[PDB]
Amino acid sequence: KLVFNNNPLPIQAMIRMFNTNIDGKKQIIKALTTIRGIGDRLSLAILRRAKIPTDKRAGELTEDELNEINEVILNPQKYDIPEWMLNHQNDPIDGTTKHLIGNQIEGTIRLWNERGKKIGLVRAFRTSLGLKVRGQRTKSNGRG
């Protein structure tokens, strides 16, 4: 009898990367947009340096494929992803550039805003009260 020979592999329901859960049925691109700090654009960048076919689903990936992606997230600058692609450029505290993942984002924004408030930076005071800081008009819109 004939056989299909074009079927996906036996698939797992969901998997863990980053203290984050990824739906195994979801195709790798929109699936890596679950981890904070991996947007659409950067998700495609990582996958083509780890060299994984974009059309596989997240639950088909081996441990090996998940290590390849895990390695590229901890150190993008090793696999020729240039610094203008990354979250945190010319860090005031370190001089360096780095890519913040998961809960590091909120923690870094907090420690930053808190420092400005300790010394009375007007920009940090407004964000704490729920006000706007990019010059937007606050009379007509943005109520409640």
Binding site: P92, G95, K118, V122
Partner: protein, 117 residues
């Protein structure tokens, strides 16, 4: 505990750098202001700061320096000084602490009182 740092540089080195060198650290819009050269007003303000840091000794505070140079970025030469910035009505006093580097003097003073209905 570690020394204060701005974009990689220690306060010891930073307080010794020329304005020309410090310019390689600052944000883009602040760099463009230093590239386009200082006004005659700004030069007097800066020369007074350099004089003051030199002149002051012991435990007594130096006198306040007043300015209407609102857009000037803060420089490592006016650290520890008391400076009055014009608010459109009065010279609002402040002390220039290390953490203010990379910002303009207008960023630390309100020209408009906060509203509570």
């Amino acid at each position: 505990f570690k020394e204060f740092s701005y974009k990689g540089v220690n306060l010891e080195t930073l307080t010794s750098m020329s304005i020309s060198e410090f310019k390689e650290l600052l944000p883009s819009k602040l760099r463009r202001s230093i590239n386009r050269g200082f006004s005659a007003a700004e030069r007097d303000f800066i020369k007074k700061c350099i004089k003051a840091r030199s002149e002051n000794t012991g435990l007594e505070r130096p006198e306040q320096i007043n300015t209407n140079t609102r857009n000037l970025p803060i420089l490592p030469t006016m650290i520890g000084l008391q400076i009055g910035v014009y608010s459109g009505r009065d010279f609002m006093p402040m002390v220039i602490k290390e953490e203010m580097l990379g910002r303009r003097l207008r960023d630390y003073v309100e020209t408009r009182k906060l509203c509570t209905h």
